[PDB]
Design a protein around this ligand. Structure first.
Ligand SMILES: CCCNC(=O)c1c(C(=O)OCC)cnn1C
Ligand SMILES: [Mg+2]
Ligand SMILES: [Zn+2]
Length: 313
């Protein structure tokens, strides 16, 4: 009850910043996650005992893949923590609870492969879920861990509060499906420029939360250059493994995933910053002006990728 989580001074200070890196000590990441929940939500909102058991079942159900791992889960929850703390009054007690758990859970049981590879492989998950294949699985794994004896961190919500939070978490996780991002940000762009955007309109909140999810999911592009640069290696380790599996099915992969075309990464990053990241943080900043640091950090890293092509590194 009177049990707080305290961090070392540098973590205590740096964690509040968008660009915070959770460091290489895995055994600290749970404490970091609880610290974020307690400051974002209250020391009340979850029974510590039940949270601590949920966090470890969640950790256990992430795999040892180069990028889509437990570290990704906590980095993505941290970025949601920075957004929610810089936009205090805009979000309800339940949204704050739901989104942090959504972000920790959003890639549960990822195998390091795209929705596309499953479809070409004809993986059984591509039969059970025709769109947002991994993402329907991720929410499905979430609900399974919530159903374990001593794991319902939501036990003390009213019945209708329970269905509201599992609905926030489902929309939140599904929205991390990048095929859905393009449409969602188009509709948010138009609604803010024709001025019809209304944060009291549930279908509008849904879209805004969805963009937040995309923004947190992508947030390795908003870190300091050396973090972003080293994360890019992990991301390409999964992409080239997938490309190798595409070749194994006798399909030529897109160049992004072809490890022979390692030369074109810097140009592939420019495409992704221009086509996805910058448009994402731009529209986010417009709706939530305190998220600007993410835009500024993204533009800086766009700049750094340009210097790699110009042969300046
Ligand atoms: C699979 C997740 C979607 N993409 C990314 O998260 C990403 C990329 C990328 O997609 O690059 C494509 C050439 C580059 N940096 N980051 C964070
Ligand atoms: Mg995902
Ligand atoms: Zn993710």
């Amino acid at each position: 009850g009177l049990m707080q989580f305290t961090l070392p001074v540098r973590l205590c200070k740096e964690i509040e910043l968008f660009h915070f890196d959770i460091g290489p000590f895995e055994n600290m990441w749970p404490g970091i996650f609880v610290y974020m929940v307690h400051r974002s939500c209250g020391t009340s909102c979850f029974e510590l005992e039940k949270l601590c058991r949920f966090i470890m079942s969640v950790k256990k159900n992430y795999r040892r893949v180069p990028y889509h791992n437990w570290k990704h889960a906590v980095t993505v929850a941290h970025c949601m923590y920075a957004i929610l703390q810089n936009n205090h009054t805009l979000f309800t007690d339940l949204e704050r609870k739901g989104l942090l758990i959504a972000c920790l859970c959003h890639d549960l049981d990822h195998r390091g492969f795209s929705n596309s590879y499953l479809q070409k492989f004809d993986h059984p998950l591509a039969a059970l879920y025709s769109t947002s294949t991994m993402e329907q699985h991720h929410f499905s794994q979430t609900v399974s861990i919530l159903q374990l004896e001593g794991h319902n961190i939501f036990s003390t919500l009213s019945s209708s509060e329970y269905e509201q939070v599992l609905e926030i978490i489902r929309k939140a996780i599904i929205a991390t499906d990048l095929a859905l991002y393009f449409g969602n940000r188009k509709q948010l762009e138009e609604m803010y420029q024709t001025g019809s955007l209304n944060l009291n309109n549930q279908s509008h909140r849904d879209r805004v939360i969805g963009l937040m999810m995309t923004a947190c999911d992508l947030c390795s592009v908003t870190k300091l250059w050396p973090v972003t640069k080293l994360t890019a290696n992990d991301i390409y380790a999964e992409f080239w493994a997938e490309g190798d599996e595409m070749k194994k099915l006798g399909i030529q992969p897109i160049p992004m995933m072809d490890r022979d075309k390692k030369d074109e990464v810097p140009q592939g990053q420019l495409g992704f910053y221009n086509a996805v990241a910058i448009p994402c943080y731009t529209t986010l900043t417009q709706i939530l002006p305190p998220t600007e640091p993410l835009l500024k950090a993204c533009r800086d890293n766009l700049s750094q990728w340009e210097k790699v092509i110009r042969g300046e590194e």
